[PDB]
Amino acid sequence: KVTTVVATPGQGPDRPQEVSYTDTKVIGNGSFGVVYQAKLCDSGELVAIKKVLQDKRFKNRELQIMRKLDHCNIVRLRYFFYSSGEKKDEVYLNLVLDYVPETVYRVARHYSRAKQTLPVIYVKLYMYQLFRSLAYIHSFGICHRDIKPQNLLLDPDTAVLKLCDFGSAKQLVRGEPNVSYICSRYYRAPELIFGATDYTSSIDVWSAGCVLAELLLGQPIFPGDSGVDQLVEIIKVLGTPTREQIREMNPNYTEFKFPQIKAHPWTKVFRPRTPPEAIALCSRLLEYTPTARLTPLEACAHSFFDELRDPNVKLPNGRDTPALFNFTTQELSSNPPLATILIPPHA
Ligand SMILES: CN(c1ncnc2[nH]c3cc(Cl)ccc3c12)[C@H]1CCCN(CCC#N)C1
């Protein structure tokens, strides 16, 4: 019932520390390993414990990356420790992380299954915090490579969003190739489908655009049945990519031949009452040419998020909005002048 381990703190002084926890239960199992909920005996706080078999055959920088990160929109790593487990001669890594009760996937599904869509204030708040989280990691050159609603945790009372699951993440280095079959299919950037190994952090921006469109639509905008059919789904919205767009995606595939299909108007992709600013923003994320997509910090600055910078904005439940403007130098480093838009005069 009470488990006591000696664990290393996620950040700060390296000295190991005795940690006890109880009330453990499984909250999810899959390709990511097993994630448990538990309660810290010391403080009584709920935590998540992610348990991952250490398998040389599968690359994984999750611990390395998480020990470096400290941001209000990224799930915090509290401790880590090694243990035995199911495979009775191998070693498991255990990550003790913050517990966050909901996910964007479940909250969106709640409306979608009732033939509603997520109220617009929450689309603004969640998308904005996701772009903040992306601006933060991209400033270290770290690409998440698995942005999707299942990996976005939410506190429904405070509207705080926290990015999680860095099992696919990697520090991208110019000139060093990266694997092309990456990202969950529906959220996979087209340059990855075209087999690019020299891609950049903008593949996360495409995935974020897929999340935004999905929150506006009530279902994935690009529900491909296969790695290849994923491209067909994209084309049936954006139209057939031109030769130059393919050259921007992967120079080695420009001779690609596909039937000529014209784009579907953005204003007809979404239902009539969709806020035009959200459509506008979506059109600048879901672009074939990877360098044409907005950067996360540019996205934060988009007019779609102006309501969040209003001094009188409030959560529907009457509470104040969460922290939105406590930008750091590291966070603003891609475009420091942008602070004058991102940080409103009242903050
Ligand atoms: C719902 N949820 C969680 N629910 C409450 N708190 C949590 N903290 C976390 C810290 C981390 Cl890094 C990861 C997950 C959680 C998490 C998981 C369930 C298992 C799947 N996973 C996403 C894939 C991975 N990996 C979401």
Side-chain angles (χ1 to χ4, degrees), residues 26-28 30-37 46-50 52 62 66 75-77 95-103 106 146 148-154 162-167:
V26 173
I27 73 199
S31 62
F32 49 84
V34 185
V35 178
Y36 302 83
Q37 184 197 116
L46 297 179
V47 296
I49 303 177
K50 178 173 173 171
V52 172
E62 180 167 30
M66 289 211 76
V75 85
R76 180 184 42 158
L77 171 75
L95 306 176
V96 186
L97 306 119
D98 277 357
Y99 172 88
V100 187
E102 279 293 340
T103 74
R106 296 170 38 90
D146 197 20
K148 57 176 182 184
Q150 292 80 351
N151 287 344
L152 311 179
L153 310 175
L154 297 175
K162 293 187 187 301
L163 176 63
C164 77
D165 192 2
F166 287 79

Side-chain angles (χ1 to χ4, degrees), residues 73-85 91-123:
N73 297 122
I74 294 166
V75 85
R76 180 184 42 158
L77 171 75
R78 290 166 176 253
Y79 307 91
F80 63 93
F81 62 94
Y82 289 90
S83 83
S84 309
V91 50
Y92 287 77
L93 175 59
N94 296 262
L95 306 176
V96 186
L97 306 119
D98 277 357
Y99 172 88
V100 187
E102 279 293 340
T103 74
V104 168
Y105 174 78
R106 296 170 38 90
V107 166
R109 208 187 49 194
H110 169 258
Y111 292 98
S112 179
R113 276 184 176 165
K115 286 190 283 220
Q116 306 158 358
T117 47
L118 184 70
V120 166
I121 186 60
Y122 295 120
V123 176

Side-chain angles (χ1 to χ4, degrees), residues 35-41 43-55 60-67 69:
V35 178
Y36 302 83
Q37 184 197 116
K39 170 169 92 187
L40 293 183
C41 300
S43 63
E45 306 201 322
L46 297 179
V47 296
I49 303 177
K50 178 173 173 171
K51 185 170 192 165
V52 172
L53 183 288
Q54 293 308 95
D55 193 327
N60 189 311
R61 297 100 171 175
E62 180 167 30
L63 177 60
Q64 196 178 26
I65 287 163
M66 289 211 76
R67 300 190 74 186
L69 300 187

Side-chain angles (χ1 to χ4, degrees), residues 190-204:
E191 59 266 34
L192 303 174
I193 304 174
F194 278 102
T197 61
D198 65 343
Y199 55 92
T200 77
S201 290
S202 69
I203 72 164
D204 285 340

